[PDB]
RNA sequence: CGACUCUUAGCGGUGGAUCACUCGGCUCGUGCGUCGAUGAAGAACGCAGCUAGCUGCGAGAAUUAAUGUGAAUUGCAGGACACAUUGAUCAUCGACACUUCGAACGCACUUGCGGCCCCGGGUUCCUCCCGGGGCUACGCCUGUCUGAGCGUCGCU
RNA sequence: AGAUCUUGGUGGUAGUAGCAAAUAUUCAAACGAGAACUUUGAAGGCCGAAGUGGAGAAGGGUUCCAUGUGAACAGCAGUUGA
RNA sequence: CUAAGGCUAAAUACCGGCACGAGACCGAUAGUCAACAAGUACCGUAAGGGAAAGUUGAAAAGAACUUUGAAGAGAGAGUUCA
RNA sequence: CGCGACCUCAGAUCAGACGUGGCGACCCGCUGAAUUUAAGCAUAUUAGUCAGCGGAGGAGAAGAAACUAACCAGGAUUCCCUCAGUAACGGCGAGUGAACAGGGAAGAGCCCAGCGCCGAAUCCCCGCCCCGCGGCGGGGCGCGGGACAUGUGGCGUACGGAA
């Protein structure tokens, strides 16, 4: 039986949770997620896709490195020096 | 019983009771709650009473 | 956005529109079809001084 | 009327800015006039509301002539209260009533020295203004 | 399909025209920017002339324009030599020089 | 030359796209080799290069490298350009000698595809449709 | 399971602390719009990622 | 009572650790407080002896920073973490000196044929 | 006479149309046009007295310092705060800090296991155990040190 | 007014089909506003050791345990409950 | 004209980003999928797919208290201009 | 029958630096369809477009003629108007399709190798001293190392140049 049958002898995970991106598609025989593909340096993005595309984007997470740059930017990356003691 | 941090070990565990109780400890058992905390038993050395120890920190 | 929303109008007609616009503008029976109130203005070509 | 093609007038933009804004400048939104006496003796118009100074109510089921001293400036509520102004609940007790700070009017400020740092600012600022325009 | 009398047309729309169109509503920013910038430049050079440097007179190349002259790039060393200015202290005292240009007349 | 990548020759479409063999690169061996040169001496920045010798099987070319924050490099006018950020890799971007020599640049009669900078950008102006505010 | 590795652990420890109810006082602050925790999971109904 | 960043400058390494130590062993018998129930001013007073160990901790923290920096000041070679922190091209681009500098030829066109103030008369 | 059914109307339900509103979009324009091994984007896990989400933050964790401002925050409680032997809140943000993955960097991970150099302790220098700190990725440039070659030579 | 139109809502059908696979329940008492279903006791039965028993792997992820509630859910009910 | 070596600003482009301004645009089935804890809930092993959901009142003044019921729920009373 | 010089290679957790990855609207280099149109369809068209890969910057690319022209000649690049749906390509079918001149926006030019001359005049690194810190520079000192005659620097580049 192809159906209610097969469907009880399912019990072996064929991804799990990738340790980049944290999405369940770290295929565990392949070593590769099917997401991003970790082991690969560079991230997995395609053009045909422009939802899967922003869903990950840059700003869709915390930015904690760029809003700062952002912020430092507007006074021209000053450093070493403190507003004038009251 | 303590709640400790999850990424201290027993040795850690019990020379951080015995610095800061100043108690001997007889040795530590350690868990990881279903929470995500750990939690240690540690025994004290038969000299020392848990009892009174636990009335000095404030826990009766 | 490409509508084509702006026309362009020769400028002999503008400059004809911009006459007609002056020489209905000194008729009281327009300037009141208008709603303007002209009833104690003097004169309705109405000049004043150059000290304004 | 405005020039400045830097400052908005769009409807949805300012009432964004209010009802936005942080507590720092919701003090400046939430000012209120001085009295006629305080007015001559200040040369100021308008002073943002403070936590212990004598107002009375000109606006609204308050009005009177009855000097009650602010109790609480609740600047998230964008009200404030007042002595005398509450109401009866249900249940007996007595509830304060808020009430916008531009529906009062000043009659004796709670003065320390900023308070008089900022009226004499105000009061400078207002001078050079007549002098340039006199 | 044709219908009745008419010109044949060819509409060159077969390219997916509409991915490239090039709209004009920054027509008069762009002149605002280019005047703002003009002001600018002739403030920066202030006693010197606003449009630049001199330009040579120029006849136009084909047998439909020779009629007209007009400016050219640069004075021609040619030009320059018989005139007694030099190469180098032309573009200094804002004279455009055009070395690749010579004179046949 | 270069043989179409397709499984068994496979090219699935109209009769004209069927050629597997007797095609060609756009772009030059030499080209390949700086390309190759400067990926994987990526922290260097390619010059140019020459050809030192051929076999039936093989080319051979050298490769002028430089390092873009090595004192002597960086401290010396008319070199200092190799070192700004909009020099790294040209030998990707096609602005070396070699690579420049099969974008189909020139002046004249004989390049008209390329007059706007490249054939892309010639491309564009081309096939972009104007229109004015005013038609 | 009962073997159980320590990240999928502490997955299932966020998990179960995120699983509970909004406090009551919530509801009495100014400007609320919250009225119960919408997010809430049973394991019965449906099932985690992993 | 409370304690400010102003006065704990001018104390030295050893009472600022003291007083650093005073502080987490005050928020242990907090939170052991917190966990035997206590009282709702030993709850409110875990944020303040939190929010003094971080102000104790930050003032040792640029001590040591500007004590670094001022020995590190004047030498070749300095850590990474005092070494400015721009932007990473920010880093790479030249230097005033080596943008400024300029070759014997430039020099001599510039010393040689220098741009004129002009006006020509209409 | 009733029930039932139909039509109409009043009232009441069910439902959420219409209208009015709008801290949202869409479009156009302007000025800037700045990421990352000094560790980015992204991810995970934590952090509030009472706090699940969102938001903010990183074991200094709904924030520290500094500067401006100038009496609040608020849902409840608590406690500050002579606002002058300096100050609540908010904003700005240039000092400091910034967990674990991740180009991710000792090796490896649906687990875990090393090596080297210092410091402290149990030891009572001698190196076993424990804790702490710093290093230990690949490619590549200049230089340095150590080398290899029945490569080319010189002297013997 | 139609597009087996899109989204949402509502009827007749209709208090209808149905709540019928694996033999089976009964008496008394307690708690309780409320008992065919809960608990205790008594009786009659079933699984019959290749079990309807006792424990694990995978998978689930707190369902485990105690206390309390009777809104919704457990296609009747419930004082019981994953 | 002088190839097979090299550099070079401006005028030009900009559906991503930071900060703004505006509109004969839309007005909660519209306008972005998203006016709201929305790339959220949820679905799929995965690639990926992906919603619904705005409005008390000026002010909570959010119905004290009495009364029937085990309660849900009612009858009075009360707040409010409603 | 060892010791040295050079050459060509190797190792190092050697001293000091640099690259990697992200975003990718605009830009550069490649690769590259088919739906579609042709009332069928194979060349053609779609289209050097979608998808795919690599590389940048605030712009990028291009760029100072091995040019256009044929005139009484213009004179780097880029962009706009026009040339022009034209010359031309095309089962000369469907369809495709520029450039020159002209008018404007902007306008900016230059550097090597080589040929030569100048006692390598040249450059990097490391120690010391002083002036400075704010992106790490200036000056001087070293019978201090190294690169470099298998060629550094100055003059000089087709508009000629040198003595
Ligand atoms: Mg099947
Ligand atoms: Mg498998
Ligand atoms: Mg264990
Ligand atoms: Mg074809
Ligand atoms: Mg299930
Ligand atoms: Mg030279
Ligand atoms: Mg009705
Ligand atoms: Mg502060
Ligand atoms: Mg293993
Ligand atoms: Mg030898
Ligand atoms: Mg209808
Ligand atoms: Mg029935
Ligand atoms: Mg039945
Ligand atoms: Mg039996
Ligand atoms: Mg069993
Ligand atoms: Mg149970
Ligand atoms: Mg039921
Ligand atoms: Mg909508
Ligand atoms: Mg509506
Ligand atoms: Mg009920
Ligand atoms: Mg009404
Ligand atoms: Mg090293
Ligand atoms: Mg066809
Ligand atoms: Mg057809
Ligand atoms: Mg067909
Ligand atoms: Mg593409
Ligand atoms: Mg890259
Ligand atoms: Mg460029
Ligand atoms: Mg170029
Ligand atoms: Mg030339
Ligand atoms: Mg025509
Ligand atoms: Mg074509
Ligand atoms: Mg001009
Ligand atoms: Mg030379
Ligand atoms: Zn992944």
Redesign the pocket.
């Known amino acids: 039986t192809k159906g209610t049958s097969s469907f009880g002898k ?19 025989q392949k ?1 590769t997620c ?3 593909g ?12 422009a ?25 021209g ?10 | 019983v303590f709640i400790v ?3 201290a ?1 027993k ?2 565990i ?2 951080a009771v015995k610095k800061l109780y100043d108690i001997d400890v007889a040795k530590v058992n350690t868990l990881i709650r ?4 750990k939690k240690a038993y540690v025994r004290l050395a038969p000299d020392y009473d848990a009892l009174d120890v636990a009335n000095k920190i404030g826990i009766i | ?1 490409w509508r084509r ?1 702006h026309r362009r109008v020769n400028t002999t007609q503008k400059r004809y529109a911009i006459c007609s616009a002056l020489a209905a503008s000194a008729l009281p029976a327009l300037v009141m079809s208008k709603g303007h109130r002209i009833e104690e203005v003097p004169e309705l070509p109405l000049v004043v001084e150059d000290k304004v | 009327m ?1 020039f400045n ?9 300012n ?2 800015r209010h ?2 804004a ?6 400046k939104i939430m000012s209120s006039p001085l009295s006629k006496e305080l007015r001559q003796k200040y040369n100021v118009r308008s002073m ?5 100074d004598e107002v009375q109510v000109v606006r ?2 308050y009005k009177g002539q009855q000097i009650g001293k ?1 109790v ?6 964008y ?1 404030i209260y007042i002595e005398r102004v509450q ?6 007790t007595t ?1 304060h ?2 009430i916008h700070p531009s529906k009062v009017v000043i009659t004796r400020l ?1 003065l ?4 008089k ?2 009226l004499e ?1 105000k009061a400078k600022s207002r001078q050079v203004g007549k002098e340039k325009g006199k | 399909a044709p219908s009745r009398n008419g010109m ?9 025209w509409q ?1 490239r169109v ?5 027509q ?3 002149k ?3 005047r ?3 002001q600018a ?1 002739a403030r920066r050079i202030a006693p010197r002339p606003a ?3 001199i ?14 002259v ?5 004075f ?2 040619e030009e320059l ?1 018989v005139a007694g200015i030099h ?2 202290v032309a ?1 200094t005292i804002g004279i ?10 | 030359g ?1 043989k ?1 990548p397709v499984p068994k020759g496979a ?8 050629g597997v063999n007797q ?5 030059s061996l030499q ?1 390949v080799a700086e ?1 190759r040169a400067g ?6 920045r390619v ?2 290069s ?1 050809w030192v010798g051929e076999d039936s099987t093989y080319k051979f070319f050298e490769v002028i ?1 430089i ?6 490099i960086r ?2 006018p ?2 200092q ?2 070192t ?7 030998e ?19 390049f ?17 449709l ?1 229109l ?1 505010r005013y038609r | ?26 509801r ?23 | ?2 304690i ?3 006065d704990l ?1 001018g104390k030295k390494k050893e009472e600022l650790l003291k007083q650093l130590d005073d502080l987490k062993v005050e928020l242990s018998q907090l939170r052991v407080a ?1 966990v035997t129930g206590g ?10 002896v ?2 003094s ?10 001590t ?3 004590n670094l ?1 001022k020995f590190y ?6 850590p ?20 400024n ?1 300029k ?4 020099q ?2 510039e010393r040689l ?1 220098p741009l004129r103030k002009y006006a020509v008369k209409a």
Not at chain 8, 53 to 62: F, G
């Open positions: 399912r019990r072996n995970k064929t991804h799990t949770l990738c340790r980049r991106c944290g999405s369940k598609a770290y295929h565990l070593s099917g997401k991003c970790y082991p690969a340096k560079r991230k997995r993005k395609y053009n045909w896709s939802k899967a595309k922003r869903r990950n984007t840059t700003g869709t997470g915390r930015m904690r490195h760029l809003k700062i740059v952002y912020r430092r930017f507007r006074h990356f000053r450093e070493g020096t403190t507003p004038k003691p009251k | 941090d999850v990424k070990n040795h850690q019990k020379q279903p929470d995500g905390e | 956005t929303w | 405005k093609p830097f400052v908005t007038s769009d409807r949805s933009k009432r964004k009802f936005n942080p507590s720092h400048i919701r003090r943002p509301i403070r936590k212990d609204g089921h602010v609480q400036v609740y600047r998230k509520k009200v109401r009866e609940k249900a249940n007996g509830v009533v808020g709670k320390d020295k900023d308070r740092k900022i600012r | 044949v047309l060819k509409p060159h729309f077969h390219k997916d991915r090039a709209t004009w509503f920054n008069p920013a762009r605002i920017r280019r703002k910038a003009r430049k449009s630049g440097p330009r040579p007179i120029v006849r136009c190349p084909t047998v439909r324009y020779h009629t007209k007009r400016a050219g790039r640069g021609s060393l030599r190469k180098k573009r455009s020089v055009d070395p690749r240009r010579r004179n046949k007349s | 270069r179409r090219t699935y479409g109209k009769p004209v796209h069927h095609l060609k690169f756009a772009r080209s390309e990926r994987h001496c990526g922290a260097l010059l140019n020459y490298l390092d873009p924050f090595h004192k002597a401290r010396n008319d070199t350009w190799i700004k950020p909009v020099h790294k890799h040209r990707m971007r096609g602005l070396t000698s070699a690579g420049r020599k099969s974008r189909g640049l020139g002046k004249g009669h004989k008209h595809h390329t007059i706007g900078g490249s054939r892309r950008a010639a491309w564009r102006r081309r096939n972009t104007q004015h | 399971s009962s073997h159980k590795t320590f990240r999928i652990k502490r997955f299932l420890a966020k998990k179960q602390k995120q699983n509970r109810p909004i406090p009551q006082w919530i009495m602050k100014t400007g609320n719009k919250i009225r119960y925790n919408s997010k809430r999971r049973h394991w019965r109904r449906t099932k985690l990622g992993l | 009572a409370k400010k960043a102003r400058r917190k009282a709702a001013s030993k709850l409110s007073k875990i944020r303040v939190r929010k160990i971080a102000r104790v901790l930050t003032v040792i923290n640029q040591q920073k500007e920096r000041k004047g030498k070749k070679y300095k990474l973490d005092l070494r400015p922190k721009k932007t990473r091209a920010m880093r790479r681009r030249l230097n005033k000196h080596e943008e500098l070759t014997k030829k430039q001599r066109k044929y």
